Design a protein around this ligand. Structure first.
Ligand SMILES: *[C@@H]1O[C@H](CO)[C@@H](O[C@@H]2O[C@H](CO)[C@@H](O)[C@H](O)[C@H]2NC(C)=O)[C@H](O)[C@H]1NC(C)=O
Ligand SMILES: *[C@@H]1O[C@H](CO)[C@@H](O)[C@H](O)[C@H]1NC(C)=O
Ligand SMILES: *[C@@H]1O[C@H](CO)[C@@H](O)[C@H](O)[C@H]1NC(C)=O
Lengths: 50, 88
């Protein structure tokens, strides 16, 4: 997927990965120690996998 | 002389007009080039709403190339003849 739509889904920060989930329908693949920080501040985001 | 001068916010250039604009004949070599003019202070984003080749992976007899400006290989972003055309 992400090779075919590289200008679409691949972003340039962890900050833009937050905003695309807050606004669009997005499933950002973040490292699991800044998922354990953003979901502490924003109670509307979550870690949906292991 | 398949000329297609057009501008605006958008515009849909199709393979339907190339038999309807009557600059071609069924079964002959075409060199029909679409010309895209932007609005002033703008940039162009070609996306594909449909793409279908009758001879896939055969970049000799059917292809779609994207020149960014004049007819130069200096500005040639992509040239598709496979099954899937990514957006430039
Ligand atoms: C209810 O859930 C939606 C998510 O489906 C919240 O987010 C909205 O999502 C749309 C696109 O999916 C975007 O315009 C914005 O991210 C959100 N829109 C608005 C108006 O907030 C939504 O915020 C939630 N809450 C309400 C009250 O609808
Ligand atoms: C998350 O989104 C909803 C919509 O406003 C709400 O429950 C909450 O205020 C948001 N989270 C934060 C930290 O603002
Ligand atoms: C583009 O926007 C202008 C105003 O910003 C508007 O007048 C114009 O009609 C728009 N273009 C088209 C093709 O409608």
């Amino acid at each position: 997927f992400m090779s075919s739509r590289r200008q679409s889904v691949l972003v340039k920060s962890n900050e833009e990965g937050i905003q695309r989930v807050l606004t669009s329908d997005y499933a950002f693949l973040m490292e699991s120690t800044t998922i354990e920080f953003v979901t502490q501040r924003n109670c509307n985001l979550t870690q949906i996998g292991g | 002389d398949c000329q297609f001068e057009l501008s605006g916010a958008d515009g849909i250039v199709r393979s339907s007009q190339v038999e309807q604009e009557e600059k071609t004949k069924p079964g002959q070599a075409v060199d029909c080039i679409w010309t895209i003019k932007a609005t002033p202070k703008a940039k162009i984003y070609l996306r594909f709403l449909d793409y279908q080749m009758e001879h896939s992976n055969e970049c000799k007899r059917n292809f779609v190339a994207v020149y960014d400006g004049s007819s130069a290989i200096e500005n040639l972003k992509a040239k598709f003849c496979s099954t899937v055309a990514n957006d430039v």
